[PDB]
Design a protein around this ligand. Sequence first.
Ligand SMILES: Cn1c(=O)n(C)c2cc(Nc3ncccc3C#N)ccc21
Ligand SMILES: Cn1c(=O)n(C)c2cc(Nc3ncccc3C#N)ccc21
Lengths: 124, 124, 5, 5
Amino acid sequence: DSCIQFTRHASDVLLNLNRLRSRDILTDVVIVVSREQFRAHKTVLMACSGLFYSIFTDQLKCNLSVINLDPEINPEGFCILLDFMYTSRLNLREGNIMAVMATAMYLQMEHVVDTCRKFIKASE
Amino acid sequence: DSCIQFTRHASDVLLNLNRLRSRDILTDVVIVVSREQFRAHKTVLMACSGLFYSIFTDQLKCNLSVINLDPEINPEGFCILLDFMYTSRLNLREGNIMAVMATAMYLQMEHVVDTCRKFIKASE
Amino acid sequence: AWVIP
Amino acid sequence: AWVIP
Ligand SMILES: Cn1c(=O)n(C)c2cc(Nc3ncccc3C#N)ccc21
Ligand SMILES: Cn1c(=O)n(C)c2cc(Nc3ncccc3C#N)ccc21
């Protein structure tokens, strides 16, 4: 059931979590990507990525405040995906699609990998 | 903007955060309401409530792992609102609307107070 | 907004 | 799902 639903609720929650990230409020992890640092909320990362879900459900790794990703990872690709996690918007361009796809495969972001493969197949 | 958007992203993030709450994964606060305890994620509470936003942006209160609410607050009303925070769905019924509205006013959940006032005005 | 889910 | 925002 006898529920009502607020259509904009989930997107408003995301917008507010992105504002907390922008102001560095309650961020609890630093992700390091080829010497560049990105602050974030562990719960948002886990909710969006198979890799972060595996890391932060691990009894040892859940205690870490700094996570280093493989240095071959493209930090612009990571930044594009982190923005997607917090906004639902993916800035996919001809010049970044290969890097974004590789990063999404590494992060285990299935829907993102799916859309990249579709855009690449349409280009060929 | 040159973005694409994943329609279900924000609701999938909420569904996953609700699954973390159900499994007690990375919950970082206990809310106590008339001797009943509710575990949650501070960031989700802040994103949904003016009261929790004020508490967890305070330099002293942000360190607390237990928050006691006014004991006059109805814990069923709180539980209904916590479920709304994590699902966008509000279980509003004739038998709980007055308690839900009072709790939403206390929590500073403006859109919820708005819909309660509308349903009450339609009933009179 | 409010709708029927 | 993927759409134009
Ligand atoms: C493979 N993969 C993927 O594409 N996304 C978007 C994923 C998200 C999560 N996480 C969760 N799944 C179930 C319950 C809770 C969470 C959280 N937080 C794990 C794997 C994912
Ligand atoms: C009065 N009120 C209300 O109805 N909702 C749903 C509210 C949410 C928040 N929170 C935020 N606002 C701006 C930036 C970040 C956050 C977070 N987290 C504060 C007051 C609210």
